[PDB]
């Protein structure tokens, strides 16, 4: 990493990422704070109306005119999970003055996130009234799409029965429609100025800048200190030895069975790149052993794929079913996770998993967001730090034994199946 790195007061911390690579400069103000089920709805709301407008430019149309004023900005806020951290996420992006004319681009957009996040549009502790109502009529809107999903819902399910022993994990990234009902211009008031004073903040700004102009600037934002120490990145529980399985009946066209595994494999372990072949060749790709197996020759499943979170150490199978086949696509599954266990794997199965890995990375290699990204996690764990040629190699070097190993460590946890009911009376 090229970062220059400054504290601005305790807690919070500015990284200059100077490139040539691009003619914008991106900005993230990243707020860093332990997953809590508590706060997750309450952030994700917040994220809303801190983004529609501010106590100075209190509607859409004023602050979309001072984006204008800004050389045409991009801004954006939003929330995410990683592991055990929920980050709530303020983006710009903003032309170089270099493409400018009469300008002064850096000190502008530095003004226009004061705005944002130390004059919200908040009168005598609470957010005013017509802006609160319509954002909490939008994400329960959002959050009922969400649920619409039944694919969604049912990994978002089968996570809730998998995490069921964190209240904290058992909730997604984004909250829930429950918890979002109770909160109010009062509790978001509140929530606000907890954030503000507690969180964990991260400045970064990637592009043709220098960190002497910088830091000046955001030394204008009047953080005050709190402690530097973040949440745990990592998830953990301990393996239980029964499995459990849940079931909900609704009316669908077609029925979902998922699956959780514990794989207590995470970013920067030994057998993570084994980990990222394993998934591949299981069911992360159409050539994987579920997807020609199970969806295609059996044809028991209209779509069966793996997913792993190398943050929170699990794997999940989510399969689309006619529900009647619950046990045997159980089975078929179970038997394609033996065969990888024993090493019944063909050269093309592991050749191909290898080039859409390196492919997708690759790709990924341009793009200022995923920089970005890449720097935070950096700055998190700095020794899981790895070159894009040292990723590659890794990548290639897997072999089958430590695909069979990354298997015989996993463990079933949970299974969810969500059971379409298409017969009356």
Request: proline residues 3%; aromatic residues 10%; hydrophobic residues 40%.
């Given at each position: 990493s090229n970062a220059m790195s400054v504290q601005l007061v305790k807690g919070v911390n500015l990284h200059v990422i100077p490139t040539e690579k691009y003619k914008t400069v991106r900005l993230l103000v990243r707020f860093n704070t332990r997953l809590n089920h508590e706060t997750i709805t309450k952030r994700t709301l917040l994220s809303s109306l801190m983004e529609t407008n501010s106590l100075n430019y209190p509607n859409q149309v004023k602050l979309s005119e001072r984006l204008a004023e800004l050389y045409g900005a991009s801004f954006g806020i939003g929330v995410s999970k990683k592991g055990n951290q929920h980050w709530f996420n303020i983006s710009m992006n903003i032309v170089n003055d270099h493409y400018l004319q009469d300008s002064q681009v850096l000190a502008e957009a530095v003004d226009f996130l004061k705005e944002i996040i130390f004059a919200p549009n908040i009168q005598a502790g609470q957010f005013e009234a017509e802006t609160f109502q319509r954002e909490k009529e939008n994400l329960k809107a959002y959050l009922e799409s969400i649920v619409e999903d039944k694919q969604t819902y049912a990994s978002l399910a089968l996570q809730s029965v998998y995490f069921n022993q964190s209240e904290d994990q058992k909730i997604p990234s984004f909250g829930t429609v429950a918890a979002l009902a109770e909160e109010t211009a009062a509790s978001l008031a509140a929530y606000y100025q907890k954030m503000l004073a507690e969180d964990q903040v991260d400045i970064f700004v990637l592009g043709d800048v220098n960190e002497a102009e910088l830091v000046p600037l955001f030394k204008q934002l009047p953080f005050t200190p709190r402690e530097e120490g973040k949440a745990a990145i990592f998830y953990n529980q301990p393996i239980r030895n029964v499995i459990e399985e849940r079931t909900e009946r609704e009316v669908l066209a077609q029925s979902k069975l998922n699956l959780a595994y514990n794989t207590?494999?995470?970013?920067?372990?030994?057998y993570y790149f084994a980990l990222q072949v394993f998934n591949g060749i299981f069911?992360?790709?159409?050539?994987s052993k579920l997807f020609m197996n199970?969806?295609?020759?059996?044809?028991?499943?209209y779509y069966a794929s793996s997913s792993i979170d190398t943050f929170r150490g699990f794997m999940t199978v989510q399969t689309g079913i006619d529900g009647k086949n619950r046990n045997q696509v159980l089975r078929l599954i179970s038997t394609e996770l033996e065969n990888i266990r024993l090493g019944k794997i063909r050269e093309l199965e592991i050749e191909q998993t290898k080039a859409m890995l390196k492919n997708q990375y690759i790709l990924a290699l341009d793009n200022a967001g995923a920089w970005l990204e890449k720097e935070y996690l950096n700055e998190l764990m700095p020794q899981t730090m790895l070159t894009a040629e040292e990723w590659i190699a890794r990548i290639n070097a897997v072999t089958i034994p430590e695909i069979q190993e990354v298997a015989k460590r996993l463990e079933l946890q949970a299974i969810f199946f969500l059971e379409g009911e298409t017969e009356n009376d």
């Amino acid at each position: 990493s090229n970062a220059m790195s400054v504290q601005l007061v305790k807690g919070v911390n500015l990284h200059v990422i100077p490139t040539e690579k691009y003619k914008t400069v991106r900005l993230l103000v990243r707020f860093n704070t332990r997953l809590n089920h508590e706060t997750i709805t309450k952030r994700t709301l917040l994220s809303s109306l801190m983004e529609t407008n501010s106590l100075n430019y209190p509607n859409q149309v004023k602050l979309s005119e001072r984006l204008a004023e800004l050389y045409g900005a991009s801004f954006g806020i939003g929330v995410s999970k990683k592991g055990n951290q929920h980050w709530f996420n303020i983006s710009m992006n903003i032309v170089n003055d270099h493409y400018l004319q009469d300008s002064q681009v850096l000190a502008e957009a530095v003004d226009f996130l004061k705005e944002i996040i130390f004059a919200p549009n908040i009168q005598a502790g609470q957010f005013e009234a017509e802006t609160f109502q319509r954002e909490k009529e939008n994400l329960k809107a959002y959050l009922e799409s969400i649920v619409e999903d039944k694919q969604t819902y049912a990994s978002l399910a089968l996570q809730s029965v998998y995490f069921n022993q964190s209240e904290d994990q058992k909730i997604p990234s984004f909250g829930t429609v429950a918890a979002l009902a109770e909160e109010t211009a009062a509790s978001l008031a509140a929530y606000y100025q907890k954030m503000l004073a507690e969180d964990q903040v991260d400045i970064f700004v990637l592009g043709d800048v220098n960190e002497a102009e910088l830091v000046p600037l955001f030394k204008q934002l009047p953080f005050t200190p709190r402690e530097e120490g973040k949440a745990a990145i990592f998830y953990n529980q301990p393996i239980r030895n029964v499995i459990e399985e849940r079931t909900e009946r609704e009316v669908l066209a077609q029925s979902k069975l998922n699956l959780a595994y514990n794989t207590d494999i995470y970013y920067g372990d030994s057998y993570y790149f084994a980990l990222q072949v394993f998934n591949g060749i299981f069911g992360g790709f159409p050539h994987s052993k579920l997807f020609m197996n199970v969806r295609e020759k059996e044809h028991l499943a209209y779509y069966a794929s793996s997913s792993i979170d190398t943050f929170r150490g699990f794997m999940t199978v989510q399969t689309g079913i006619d529900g009647k086949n619950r046990n045997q696509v159980l089975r078929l599954i179970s038997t394609e996770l033996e065969n990888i266990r024993l090493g019944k794997i063909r050269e093309l199965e592991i050749e191909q998993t290898k080039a859409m890995l390196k492919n997708q990375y690759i790709l990924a290699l341009d793009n200022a967001g995923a920089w970005l990204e890449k720097e935070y996690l950096n700055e998190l764990m700095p020794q899981t730090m790895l070159t894009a040629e040292e990723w590659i190699a890794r990548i290639n070097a897997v072999t089958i034994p430590e695909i069979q190993e990354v298997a015989k460590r996993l463990e079933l946890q949970a299974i969810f199946f969500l059971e379409g009911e298409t017969e009356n009376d």
